[PDB]
Scaffold this active site. Structure first.
Site, mmCIF file in Angstrom:
data_model
loop_
_atom_site.group_PDB
_atom_site.id
_atom_site.type_symbol
_atom_site.label_atom_id
_atom_site.label_comp_id
_atom_site.label_asym_id
_atom_site.label_seq_id
_atom_site.Cartn_x
_atom_site.Cartn_y
_atom_site.Cartn_z
ATOM 1 N N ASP A 187 5.842 10.389 17.409
ATOM 2 C CA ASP A 187 6.048 10.482 15.903
ATOM 3 C C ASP A 187 4.942 11.144 15.302
ATOM 4 O O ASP A 187 4.708 11.050 14.097
ATOM 5 C CB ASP A 187 6.580 9.359 15.219
ATOM 6 C CG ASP A 187 7.301 9.726 13.736
ATOM 7 O OD1 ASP A 187 7.750 10.709 13.574
ATOM 8 O OD2 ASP A 187 7.242 8.804 13.035
ATOM 9 N N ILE A 233 1.008 -1.237 -0.080
ATOM 10 C CA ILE A 233 -0.161 -0.133 -0.008
ATOM 11 C C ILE A 233 0.825 1.579 -0.052
ATOM 12 O O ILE A 233 0.311 2.288 -0.323
ATOM 13 C CB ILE A 233 -0.992 0.068 1.069
ATOM 14 C CG1 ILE A 233 -0.201 -0.124 2.256
ATOM 15 C CG2 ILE A 233 -1.793 -1.170 1.017
ATOM 16 C CD1 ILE A 233 -1.193 -0.012 3.810
ATOM 17 N N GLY A 251 9.835 4.970 4.608
ATOM 18 C CA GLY A 251 11.307 5.141 5.489
ATOM 19 C C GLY A 251 11.755 3.928 6.033
ATOM 20 O O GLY A 251 13.024 3.702 5.848
ATOM 21 N N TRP A 254 8.814 -1.297 2.633
ATOM 22 C CA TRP A 254 7.499 -1.551 2.184
ATOM 23 C C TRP A 254 6.300 -1.849 3.248
ATOM 24 O O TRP A 254 6.708 -2.330 4.189
ATOM 25 C CB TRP A 254 7.445 -2.656 0.875
ATOM 26 C CG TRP A 254 8.206 -2.356 -0.203
ATOM 27 C CD1 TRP A 254 9.582 -2.565 -0.684
ATOM 28 C CD2 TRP A 254 7.358 -1.569 -1.144
ATOM 29 N NE1 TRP A 254 9.641 -2.252 -1.849
ATOM 30 C CE2 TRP A 254 8.399 -1.585 -2.175
ATOM 31 C CE3 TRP A 254 6.293 -0.828 -1.502
ATOM 32 C CZ2 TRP A 254 8.326 -0.687 -3.330
ATOM 33 C CZ3 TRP A 254 6.061 -0.255 -2.677
ATOM 34 C CH2 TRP A 254 7.081 -0.111 -3.760
ATOM 35 N N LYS A 282 3.551 -3.867 9.168
ATOM 36 C CA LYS A 282 4.191 -2.900 8.934
ATOM 37 C C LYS A 282 5.632 -3.098 9.642
ATOM 38 O O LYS A 282 5.482 -3.987 10.771
ATOM 39 C CB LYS A 282 3.633 -1.717 9.554
ATOM 40 C CG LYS A 282 4.614 -0.385 9.670
ATOM 41 C CD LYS A 282 3.945 0.811 10.208
ATOM 42 C CE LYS A 282 4.791 2.018 9.926
ATOM 43 N NZ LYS A 282 4.038 3.131 10.597
HETATM 44 MG MG LIG Z 1 7.032 6.744 12.341
#
Ligand SMILES: [Mg+2]
Length: 292
Positions: free
Chosen positions: A162, A48, A52, A55, A72
């Site tokens: 973050d 999708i 950084g 994938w 993830k």
């Molecule tokens: Mg992050």
């Protein structure tokens, strides 16, 4: 009483990146493809996004009929089992859900298995504009909508670390924080996976805190509402001055809020989310009064 505009989710036949499209120079093909099986439970469907950290995959969960999940990458002894336990213990409608943590020999670092959120990110919504920024009252509305998720983490003694427009997804009339892997306890040790240009200056030296999360809220709100100067691929520190920004001259109270939220000294920011929310409501009213 903020009413967020309803964002219709994209159809299922538009979720994956097309494997037959040429990639920008410097990007490698996905290590997993459609048909692969991860941990004898997740059936890979495609990618999708390329982030950084690598994938980002979409997959079917065999343990729950009809469940679609995101795979993830996890970032790099016994507390690790307790931290993964805490992430799966997070319960809030404004935060993406974590279902599992798995390994695969083809992708070093392993995956976090989390809920898929359909909508576009707040960075996508900015890009959809002629100057690449959102209307100020709408951006404030988005911030107010994610504050309950932030304050829930803080009440549990942890921080998001973050926050930035690209990991806030607007689905329907709500927003969800999606960067579960970045969460740490308040005052946690080790490297914090924030993003330079959004992260508070003291995180690298004193650890993360509610105050450092407040800082990322201010930088996120600035990034949503105005172009920001860049220095070597990083958003430059500070809020632009009113003498250089017609937006900030129009809403000086908005400038004061951004400056307070991102003060160098953590003792000079808002003490918690509720204190920020109160001033946000006041700024939103002053903005709607001046504009209209
Ligand atoms: Mg992050």
């Amino acid at each position: 009483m903020v009413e967020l505009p309803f964002i219709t989710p994209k159809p299922e036949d538009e979720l994956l990146i097309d494997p037959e499209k040429k990639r920008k120079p410097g990007v490698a093909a996905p290590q997993l493809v459609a048909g692969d099986i991860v941990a004898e439970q997740y059936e890979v469907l495609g990618v999708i996004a390329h982030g950084g950290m690598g994938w980002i995959y979409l997959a079917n969960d065999r343990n729950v009929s009809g469940r679609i999940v995101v795979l993830k990458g996890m970032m790099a002894q016994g507390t690790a089992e307790a931290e993964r336990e805490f992430l799966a213990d997070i319960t809030h409608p404004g935060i993406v859900k974590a279902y599992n943590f798995i390994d695969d020999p083809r992708v070093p670092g392993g995956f976090i298995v989390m809920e898929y959120v359909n909508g576009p990110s707040l960075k996508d919504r900015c890009k959809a504009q002629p100057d690449g920024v959102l209307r100020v009252d709408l951006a404030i509305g988005y911030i107010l909508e994610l504050l309950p998720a932030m304050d829930y983490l803080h009440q549990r003694g942890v921080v998001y670390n973050d926050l930035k427009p690209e990991n806030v997804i607007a689905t329907e009339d709500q927003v969800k924080l999606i960067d579960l892997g970045a969460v740490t306890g308040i005052g946690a040790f080790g490297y914090i996976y924030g993003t330079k240009g959004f992260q508070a200056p003291e995180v690298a030296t004193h650890g993360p805190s509610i105050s450092s999360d407040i800082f990322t809220i201010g930088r996120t709100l600035a990034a949503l509402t105005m172009p920001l100067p860049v220095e070597d691929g990083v958003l430059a520190p500070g809020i632009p001055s009113p003498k250089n920004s017609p937006l900030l001259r129009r809403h000086l109270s908005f400038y004061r809020l951004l400056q307070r939220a991102t003060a160098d000294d953590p003792q000079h920011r808002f003490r918690n989310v509720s204190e920020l929310r109160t001033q946000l409501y006041g700024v939103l009213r002053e903005i709607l009064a001046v504009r209209d």
